[PDB]
Amino acid sequence: SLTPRCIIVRAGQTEWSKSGQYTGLTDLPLTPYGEGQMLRTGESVFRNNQFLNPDNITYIFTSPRLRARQTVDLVLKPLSDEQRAKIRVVVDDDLREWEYGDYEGMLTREIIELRKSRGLDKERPWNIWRDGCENGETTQQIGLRLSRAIARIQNLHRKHQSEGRASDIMVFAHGHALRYFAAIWFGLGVQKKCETIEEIQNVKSYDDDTVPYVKLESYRHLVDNPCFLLDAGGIGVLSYAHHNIDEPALELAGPFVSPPE
Amino acid sequence: SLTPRCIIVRAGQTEWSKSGQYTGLTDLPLTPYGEGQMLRTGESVFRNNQFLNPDNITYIFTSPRLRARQTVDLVLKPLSDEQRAKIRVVVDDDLREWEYGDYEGMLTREIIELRKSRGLDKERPWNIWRDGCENGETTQQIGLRLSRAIARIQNLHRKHQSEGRASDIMVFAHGHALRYFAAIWFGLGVQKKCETIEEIQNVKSYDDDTVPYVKLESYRHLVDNPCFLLDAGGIGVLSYAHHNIDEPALELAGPFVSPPE
Ligand SMILES: O=C(COP(=O)(O)O)[C@H](O)[C@@H](O)C(O)COP(=O)(O)O
Ligand SMILES: O=C(COP(=O)(O)O)[C@H](O)[C@@H](O)C(O)COP(=O)(O)O
């Protein structure tokens, strides 16, 4: 039975994403162009190309942000009611974007100028993946919460493979969160034992009894840029080598596969 | 003008690749199924989806192996004579597969059995990315030659971007070589100064005067599995963040892009 996959999908275009402004918590909608964009994406992957087979989708995880949720609706439009009824949708707060704090709605170069004026970054340039954001999340905070979601997804994958089913699980989220998610999925960054109060607690970030909570002994986080590109409405694919959930791997073809004979 | 890209393409199916046998120097052809498969891939990326625009392809680099070259022919079949005339094709020996030496045409598990019988791998399992192959290439050796090709390609990218043109450069090669190639492209592994006689010399691995040779001061190589999947006839995409050749990045969407408005 087909190796399980995690399909990452970045929210479609917003007014801020279009112009490079850091959109974290701000609950922006898709632009009219972004709606069209995500509609076309859904048609490409389901109808025109069959890069995804609905019969194989088991779970869709989404950030609680409007633009992620809108992206789920538009991308899944090509499905029949029957196909939809068999797919479970779960809103997971662990998949929200990096909390930018003071940097919300700013540009990269504005962030650099703001920090320089606070007297930081004297020895080396700011690097979100190492430093986090003043009044927002550190890298260990985002790494921790994405690890918990990854553990939940990989646990469903293992449960499904052992029930003899295919399992594509979709994750709709954001540009930083998803690059980060992909990075640790396949082993980037460092391993950190769960020890502090923050690191151990059940957070209760989603509400859906069919998704077992997995309590982490340890987690991964980044200390440097993993150097990924993922555009607004871009799609990436995470899976496993040799049908083995213990060998998570990055699919270099993203969602592309050669057309069947 | 569009950020330059390197489009990696793995040779289509062979009799050995279908069955997991390590195909290095052995000059196998595509199976009949593999031909069909690469023909359909070409139509998907140029005609049915336009994931690739021929007007933007400047160079195609290919391993000297028959199966890679055959893959070039079939994937580019949808192009007109006019489009082909403007694209330069370069055979580059630096893009050959990992030299397997003793392991040629063997299965992973056979290689493990063979090594265990020579009394190796007592402390930890064989890991090609660290250990290389008896009578074949070390990881340094492959990392060095792939680094030279990367430098040549990125130098053409920089020359083109500074001439104001788009540049998609395709690289047709092999499963280990391309995963390795992708891993170091975006900064995995370690930096090693060029110092030994091997590391410094001009090897003359291609013959095309329009490709400036770049003499490396230093190179990258892996010391561990980068955990990528890339199937036979799989397509990946390497590029740069912020239109900057000094920021090479992995495209998580491989060749997928949402259909234009
Ligand atoms: O804030 C966004 C994420 O949220 P969504 O737009 O996905 O909601 C993006 O990740 C970009 O604004 C961004 O900073 C890209 O930074 P880069 O790494 O290119 O220097
Ligand atoms: O020899 C091949 C490359 O040659 P082409 O078939 O691409 O020429 C492949 O790289 C396979 O042999 C292979 O071992 C996959 O290893 P894995 O990582 O799955 O454990």
Side-chain angles (χ1 to χ4, degrees), chain A residues 40 49 227 229 235 250 252 259, chain B residues 40 49 227 229 250 252-253 259:
Chain A
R40 293 184 299 275
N49 289 289
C227 301
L229 306 164
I235 300 192
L250 164 74
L252 290 178
Chain B
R40 292 183 304 272
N49 288 290
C227 304
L229 306 165
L250 166 70
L252 291 177

Side-chain angles (χ1 to χ4, degrees), chain A residues 10 17 20-23 67 97 100 108 174-176 179, chain B residues 242:
Chain A
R10 184 173 168 199
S17 75
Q21 300 181 68
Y22 283 43
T23 324
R67 69 195 173 268
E97 183 54 294
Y100 301 124
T108 293
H174 308 282
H176 277 103
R179 287 183 280 167
Chain B
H242 312 112

Side-chain angles (χ1 to χ4, degrees), chain B residues 100-145:
Chain B
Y100 302 126
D102 283 7
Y103 312 156
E104 194 60 24
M106 297 184 62
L107 307 164
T108 297
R109 71 169 170 281
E110 285 169 348
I111 299 164
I112 298 162
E113 189 190 350
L114 175 55
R115 286 173 70 80
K116 150 173 291 54
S117 89
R118 284 152 175 191
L120 313 167
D121 315 323
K122 271 163 182 164
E123 317 160 81
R124 57 186 177 191
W126 173 61
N127 173 344
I128 192 188
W129 311 95
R130 185 195 57 232
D131 302 321
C133 306
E134 286 165 277
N135 291 328
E137 274 178 303
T138 66
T139 196
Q140 233 102 156
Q141 284 166 333
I142 178 150
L144 168 80
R145 60 187 178 76

Side-chain angles (χ1 to χ4, degrees), chain A residues 242, chain B residues 10 17 21-23 67 97 100 174-176 179:
Chain A
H242 313 112
Chain B
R10 190 180 161 187
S17 72
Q21 298 179 71
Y22 279 43
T23 323
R67 66 198 177 268
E97 182 54 293
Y100 302 126
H174 307 281
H176 275 102
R179 289 187 277 172

Side-chain angles (χ1 to χ4, degrees), chain A residues 33 35-45 48, chain B residues 258-261:
Chain A
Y33 171 92
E35 292 184 17
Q37 171 200 39
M38 294 329 295
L39 270 172
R40 293 184 299 275
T41 295
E43 282 146 28
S44 184
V45 297
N48 305 309
Chain B
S258 32
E261 194 176 279

